[PDB]
Amino acid sequence: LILCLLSAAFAPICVGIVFLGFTPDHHCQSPGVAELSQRCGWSPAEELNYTVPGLGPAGEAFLGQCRRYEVDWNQSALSCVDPLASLATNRSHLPLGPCQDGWVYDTPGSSIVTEFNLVCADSWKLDLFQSCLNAGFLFGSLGVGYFADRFGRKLCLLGTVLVNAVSGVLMAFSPNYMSMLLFRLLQGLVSKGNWMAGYTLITEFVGRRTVAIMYQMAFTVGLVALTGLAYALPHWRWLQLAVSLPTFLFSFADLFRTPRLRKRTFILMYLWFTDSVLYQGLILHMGATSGNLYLDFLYSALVEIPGAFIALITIDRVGRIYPMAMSNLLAGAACLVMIFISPDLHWLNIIIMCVGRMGITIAIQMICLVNAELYPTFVRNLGVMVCSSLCDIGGIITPFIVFRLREVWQALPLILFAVLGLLAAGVTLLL
Numbered sequence: 062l063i064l065c066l067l068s069a070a071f072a073p074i075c076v077g078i079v080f081l082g083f084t085p086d087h088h089c090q091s092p093g094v095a096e097l098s099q100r101c102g103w104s105p106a107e108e109l110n111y112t113v114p115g116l117g118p119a120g121e122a123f124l125g126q127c128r129r130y131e132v133d134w135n136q137s138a139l140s141c142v143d144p145l146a147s148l149a150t151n152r153s154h155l156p157l158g159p160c161q162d163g164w165v166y167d168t169p170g171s172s173i174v175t176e177f178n179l180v181c182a183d184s185w186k187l188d189l190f191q192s193c194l195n196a197g198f199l200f201g202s203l204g205v206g207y208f209a210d211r212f213g214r215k216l217c218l219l220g221t222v223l224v225n226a227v228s229g230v231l232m233a234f235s236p237n238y239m240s241m242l243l244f245r246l247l248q249g250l251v252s253k254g255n256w257m258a259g260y261t262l263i264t265e266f267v268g269r270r271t272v273a274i275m276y277q278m279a280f281t282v283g284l285v286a287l288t289g290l291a292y293a294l295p296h297w298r299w300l301q302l303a304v305s306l307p308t309f310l311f312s313f314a315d316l317f318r319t320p321r322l323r324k325r326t327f328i329l330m331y332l333w334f335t336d337s338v339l340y341q342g343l344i345l346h347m348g349a350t351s352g353n354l355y356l357d358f359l360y361s362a363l364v365e366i367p368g369a370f371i372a373l374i375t376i377d378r379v380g381r382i383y384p385m386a387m388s389n390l391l392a393g394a395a396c397l398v399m400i401f402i403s404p405d406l407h408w409l410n411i412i413i414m415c416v417g418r419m420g421i422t423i424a425i426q427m428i429c430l431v432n433a434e435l436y437p438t439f440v441r442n443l444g445v446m447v448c449s450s451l452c453d454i455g456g457i458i459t460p461f462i463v464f465r466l467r468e469v470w471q472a473l474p475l476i477l478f479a480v481l482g483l484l485a486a487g488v489t490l491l492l
């Protein structure tokens with residue numbers, strides 16, 4: 062089943078930013094600190110205490126993660142217990158320039174942020190890393206549909222798979238960030254078409270629910286394997302190469318005219334947008350907040366595992382519309398409750414994250430079926446395409462809010478996610 066391997070390889074494409082683009086605890090690389098360490102060999106914690114500016118009173122880490130001290134280190138370094146105290150009575154009196162000579166990242170491995178220096182003023186480029194993938198996804202969803210009839214349904218599939226694998230492998234060897242983003246764009250252009258084509262072949266050729274749920278199980282197995290490889294392979298180059306190698310070695314007005322289809326299209330577009338935003342934002346919040354990233358990701362994948370089974374059980378008996386509202390409300394409520402969790406608690410945090418991700422899983426399981434079943438035979442493809450288009454729009458928007466509102470308030474992305482989740486739960490009762 063090479064299609065299961067394709068699904069597994071798709072998982073680190075849409076989600077692997079968590080393990081490739083992780084942000085270590087960095088600070089300005091100040092020359093002369095090595096000389097002071099040679100003069101007296103303090104611990105690295107003492108190095109950060111005596112060199113890096115302290116965190117802000119309101120938990121602002123910007124003053125230490127992106128600023129240095131102008132006090133000379135080569136000279137006037139007689140004091141070692143507290144060199145900054147001798148220079149000035151108050152730490153704030155000393156000049157605080159920018160990271161002129163780079164950064165020092167406190168991880169043994171390597172990351173896209175560590176490699177291309179996507180920190181401080183460039184911290185939005187890590188957002189651009191995922192936004193380019195999702196803009197890819199969108200433009201590729203248009204282009205592959207346009208080009209399928211040009212070269213057939215098999216030559217085009219083979220070409221797109223080859224371009225995906227080659228783009229990933231060349232991504233592992235990207236010299237600068239511009240080539241990185243270009244390969245992300247190409248991979249996004251081809252990869253969504255690859256996944257959708259694989260799903261279509263695994264559904265139609267067999268002659269339905271079982272192969273589909275096995276396909277999402279393949280995706281979750283790919284997520285688990287991504288966690289394992291990220292644990293085994295720290296450097297992002299190694300992880301990207303070892304993820305790309307498997308798959309390499311093997312009308313528009315017909316949905317809006319009548320009020321009946323217009324309202325249903327609006328609801329489905331909003332549901333796709335909201336749940337895509339919730340899923341990607343929850344994953345990114347995990348990446349940017351949890352200090353147990355590997356185990357938290359493994360637990361969330363292992364909770365995605367029974368979410369599909371729960372959805373399959375519910376759709377047989379409960380229905381489709383009713384469990385969608387419950388799952389969306391569960392995700393929104395989990396996001397809302399995580400705001401009030403104290404930083405000391407971690408077990409409750411991961412439990413609530415698992416509940417929210419299970420809710421998102423079940424919600425997406427009913428979204429696929431309801432999207433399929435709410436359109437006529439001729440307009441079903443157009444409806445699915447436009448709904449996935451809004452899904453990709455939400456995917457574009459998600460990084461630029463998840464990683465940018467945290468700079469203003471770490472609980473603001475969670476507030477927005479809760480509002481979106483409860484609004485979607487209320488909305489999906491109108492179908």
Ligand SMILES: CC(=O)S[C@@H]1CC2=CC(=O)CC[C@]2(C)[C@H]2CC[C@@]3(C)[C@@H](CC[C@@]34CCC(=O)O4)[C@H]12
Binds near residue numbers: 277281369
């Ligand atoms: C980031 C996302 O939005 S989800 C992720 C990406 C995606 C977008 C598409 O529309 C095309 C296909 C995919 C790959 C989804 C496939 C189905 C996935 C695996 C979903 C994650 C949750 C779900 C439903 C429940 C389950 O068992 O897995 C996949």
